[PDB]
């Protein structure tokens, strides 16, 4: 189980290490044969090579099987030219390795749907993974341009994009509950229509797994509603991106929140949380999205379902028994970690 | 005060004229000069003239200052040719009037929020109109196409679709909270930024009224996690139509709510609810969301906002008095409509 370890700014380091203690125990408990060297990354690695994402950091990640990846981004580095600043980085990681597909699971664990938005009869079971297109779309489409009179941007996808993200979704929710909704507007887009026809044809690879479809516009409504009736949903980039938004504040807890690109190159695994350079040493900096990281990286990177399932539940319980300050209490990183630990043997 | 009264189909006789009996009893109370005319609209249309809209209706809509439209639609006529479906009649009323903005509001009237999906305190006091940009964008764009390879659309819109449904969103706020938030991609789309400059730029002209923007994926999880914040909220179509979907789910009753289309001609004023044939006769219907669009008329076709006002009072304090079936009691149309004119009087 080969790691690069990019642990980057701010409370980077700490989160990125608590996540590195949950490892090497699964890796001694159960022998995955781990091994990981820890790279440069972001404002660091601008203030000490000159560049977020140095040469080094770019060959470990091409030799690597996962990036575990921490936190990047500072006031200090906010400044500088738009070739070297750390949210660029971020780009030409995702770049070096083409990944096209971001999973961003949102889940109100038991007991937690205090923390919600919605009523706790709706946030109860909460658990969906949105699966974003991230290299096509409009944010990309040509042509594209603005004058005095109007602008224009399009909406273009070939089947190659859809097939390649909906694959994923597919692959995923074999993992989960083997359910996936794509969503498109097929009632009144081309892009809508093809990009359903595609996910349908790509379907049928996958006999085990059940798919619907539904347009954005009821996804939304539904993803308040009733989210808890949802296991993967696919979805085109700007689609993704408003419904992985949405999605996500539905735990009612931002800060739990992991992330991971997939592609063609090494997987990474990261926080949805920022590098909150605040209170990075203090050591209170809540690890459970580093920690849920870890665990995505386990089920994507090497299909270790089972242990990720196990690191979930372990997380879970600790969340409860040992509430960190965001959920009202008092357990710092160290000892938020260790009740982890300590349901994990 | 010269309304044209469209009721449709199914409960749109009994929902319309309950809306009608307030608007009289206003009429008699303040001398509105109330002057209304019913005319065949929808499937009623289709069975007595062989099509949805009518000449008769058309002139009708033509010479009127306002409409008070029913719900349209029903099985028998879901078989017919496109071009006389129910459905398609709606759209032919708004190209008729050149309708370039729908404004649907969600509120959470006092004592309701036990009916949101979002917990009390986050649903108490919300009150949001979304305006959505009707006849533009992406819906409509040129170029667009499909092939076995690829398929697009174009997100395009030109200085005066903007500007006109920016002036509507800046002129609903000074009727309500003075405030506006236009939502946009300008961080990543052309379309965005200009839409965005062109916002600000008619915003001058309105210098009572306060303009913030938002990002749209910005701007979903604001909806879920304090949409108490907003006031008037005014964005491109296929955003619009997503915003407006997700706010319309914030009441957690969508019986409830009115629409109301604004353009160059006769305004309409609609209830969101269709026809509910399977109810139709039994005087169960609510009404609310009817009396409701009657407010939305006075409000917005003849600037009566302190009467629209002190309707939606009324609805509200009826909602709490009598509760219709929907929101588990027993009064039935003419019982609620009756205890909104013992508010009014």
Redesign the interface.
């Given at each position: 189980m080969k790691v690069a370890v990019l642990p980057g700014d701010g409370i980077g380091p700490e989160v990125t290490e608590a996540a590195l203690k949950v490892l090497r125990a699964l890796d001694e408990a159960e022998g995955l044969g781990l091994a990981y060297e820890v790279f440069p990354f972001g404002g660091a690695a601008i203030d000490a090579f000159g560049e977020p994402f140095p040469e080094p950091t770019r060959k470990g990640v091409e030799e690597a099987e996962a990036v575990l990846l921490g936190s990047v981004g500072g006031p200090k580095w906010d400044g500088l030219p738009r070739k070297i600043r750390p949210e660029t980085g971020l780009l030409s990681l995702r770049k070096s390795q083409d990944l096209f597909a971001n999973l961003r699971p949102a889940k109100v664990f038991p007991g937690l749907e205090r923390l919600?938005?919605?009523?706790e009869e709706?946030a109860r079971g909460v658990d969906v993974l949105i699966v974003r297109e991230l290299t096509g779309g409009?944010?990309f489409?040509e042509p594209?341009?603005?004058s005095?009179?109007?602008?224009?941007?399009?909406?273009?996808?070939?089947?190659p994009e859809v097939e390649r993200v909906a694959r994923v979704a597919f692959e995923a929710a074999r993992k989960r509950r083997k359910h996936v909704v794509s969503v498109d507007?097929a009632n009144?887009?081309?892009?809508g229509?093809?990009?359903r026809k595609t996910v349908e044809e790509v379907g049928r690879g996958y006999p085990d797994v059940a798919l619907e479809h539904q347009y954005?516009?009821?996804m939304?409504?539904h993803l308040?509603?009733s989210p808890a009736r949802f296991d993967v949903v696919v979805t085109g980039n700007?689609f993704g991106?408003?419904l992985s938004?949405?999605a996500?504040?539905?735990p009612?807890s931002l800060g739990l929140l992991p992330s991971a690109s997939l592609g063609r190159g090494t997987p990474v695994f990261e926080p949805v949380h920022g590098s909150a350079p605040d209170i990075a040493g203090k050591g209170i900096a809540n690890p459970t999205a580093a920690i849920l990281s870890a665990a995505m990286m386990l089920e994507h990177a090497f299909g270790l379902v089972e242990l990720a399932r196990k690191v979930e539940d372990a997380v879970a319980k600790a969340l409860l028994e040992t509430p960190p300050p965001d959920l009202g209490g008092s357990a710092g990183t160290e000892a938020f970690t260790a009740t982890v630990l300590r349901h994990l043997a």
């Open positions: 919600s938005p919605l009523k709706i409009i944010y489409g594209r341009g603005m005095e009179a109007e602008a224009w941007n399009t909406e273009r996808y070939s089947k507007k009144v887009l081309e892009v229509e093809f990009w954005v516009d009821a939304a409504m308040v509603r700007i991106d408003i938004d949405l996500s504040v539905l009612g």
